[PDB]
Amino acid sequence: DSEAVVAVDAVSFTLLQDQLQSVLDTLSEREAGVVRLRFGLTDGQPRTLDEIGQVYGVTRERIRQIESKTMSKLRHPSRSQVLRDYL
Amino acid sequence: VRLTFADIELDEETHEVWKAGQPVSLSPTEFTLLRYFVINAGTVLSKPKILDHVWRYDFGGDVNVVESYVSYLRRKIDTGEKRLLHTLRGVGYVLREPR
Amino acid sequence: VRLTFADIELDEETHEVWKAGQPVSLSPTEFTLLRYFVINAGTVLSKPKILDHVWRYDFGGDVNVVESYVSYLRRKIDTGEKRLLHTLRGVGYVLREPR
Amino acid sequence: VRLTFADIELDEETHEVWKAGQPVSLSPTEFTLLRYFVINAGTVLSKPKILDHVWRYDFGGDVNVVESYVSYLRRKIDTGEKRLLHTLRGVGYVLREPR
Numbered sequence: 001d002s003e004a005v006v007a008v009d010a011v012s013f014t015l016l017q018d019q020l021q022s023v024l025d026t027l028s029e030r031e032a033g034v035v036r037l038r039f040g041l042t043d044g045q046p047r048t049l050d051e052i053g054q055v056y057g058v059t060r061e062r063i064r065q066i067e068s069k070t071m072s073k074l075r076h077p078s079r080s081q082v083l084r085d086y087l
Numbered sequence: 088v089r090l091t092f093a094d095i096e097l098d099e100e101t102h103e104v105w106k107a108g109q110p111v112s113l114s115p116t117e118f119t120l121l122r123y124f125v126i127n128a129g130t131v132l133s134k135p136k137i138l139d140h141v142w143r144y145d146f147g148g149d150v151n152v153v154e155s156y157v158s159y160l161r162r163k164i165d166t167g168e169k170r171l172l173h174t175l176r177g178v179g180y181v182l183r184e185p186r
Numbered sequence: 187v188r189l190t191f192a193d194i195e196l197d198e199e200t201h202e203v204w205k206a207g208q209p210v211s212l213s214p215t216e217f218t219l220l221r222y223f224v225i226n227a228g229t230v231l232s233k234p235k236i237l238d239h240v241w242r243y244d245f246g247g248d249v250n251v252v253e254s255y256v257s258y259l260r261r262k263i264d265t266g267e268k269r270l271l272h273t274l275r276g277v278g279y280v281l282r283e284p285r
Numbered sequence: 286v287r288l289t290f291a292d293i294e295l296d297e298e299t300h301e302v303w304k305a306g307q308p309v310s311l312s313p314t315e316f317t318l319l320r321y322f323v324i325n326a327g328t329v330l331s332k333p334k335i336l337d338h339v340w341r342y343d344f345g346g347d348v349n350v351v352e353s354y355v356s357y358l359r360r361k362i363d364t365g366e367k368r369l370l371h372t373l374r375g376v377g378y379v380l381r382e383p384r
Contacts, residue, residue: 061150100325131199177214
């Protein structure tokens with residue numbers, strides 16, 4: 001049964017999202033919320049920059065700068081190593 | 088060790104530049120951008136990674152700084168409107184001799 | 187490291203393409219579509235897949251955008267009525283050299 | 286083994302200076318400054334890398350000390366307001382005869 005749950009990948013994914021939330025909590029709460037709403041983590045809806053601005057009271061360009069900060073500070077190899085192994 | 092390209096020639100010791108061999112003085116940050124620009128001659132550079140490496144990550148300023156800097160580079164070295172440092176709409180800039 | 191198919195030649199470094207050796211400039215998203223095609227030359231691409239990957243996931247528009255774009259690629263590179271960029275009704279688009 | 290530059294000439298054995306052939310006494314820590322400055326003659330010197338090499342890494346003072354030191358270098362030899370020890374805003378100083 002292809003659709004049957006392998007029961008290992010699901011558990012792995014549970015710890016995987018645990019690792020994700022732990023890593024993102026290292027980042028600033030504002031940046032954490034930005035990326036969460038950016039890729040649809042709390043919900044299933046990734047959101048456009050204007051939604052992030054209207055929920056943060058900021059312009060879309062500043063959210064672009066925030067995204068730059070997020071994925072730059074994310075490339076810092078301490079995060080890179082602890083998230084790379086999980087694949 | 089000197090970095091040269093077409094008509095732009097650079098020296099890494101005193102950080103001056105030869106534009107077709109005639110002297111030219113320039114602002115420091117503009118030299119930093121041109122030094123990025125010459126290491127990756129023929130490689131496209133986008134505003135984000137230029138801001139990341141040449142500019143300080145803590146740059147909370149507005150984005151017009153880099154286009155103004157490229158404008159200074161234009162008026163300093165590439166006087167003609169058509170120039171070697173090309174601008175890519177929403178993709179950034181690149182160094183290449185016109186074909 | 188450059189990507190080639192038939193007569194189409196790609197340089198990923200400074201973002202320009204060759205179609206049997208005469209210059210060409212092309213729009214950014216159309217460039218990305220061509221990149222997705224050549225990197226999957228030998229594999230058919232399905233439209234929802236393309237709007238998923240090359241296009242941003244939040245795309246809430248209609249579908250006709252992708253056919254307009256591929257029409258741009260055809261009129262740019264495959265000017266002839268028969269093309270190297272074939273079309274499958276309801277399956278998407280693909281890059282085949284005709285047999 | 287003696288090092289000379291234009292009119293500034295330096296001896297490594299007894300730490301004394303001729304300015305266009307005229308001997309002038311100088312401070313010890315200030316002596317180290319031009320020793321760097323001629324050992325990198327024609328090279329731009331920046332205050333940080335002066336601080337690390339010339340000065341001890343335990344230096345807990347401010348940045349005005351080197352500026353006053355350079356001003357001291359101005360008034361001793363290159364007394365003119367326009368001087369061979371040129372000033373780079375945020376990049377430091379360079380040894381060169383004016384063009």
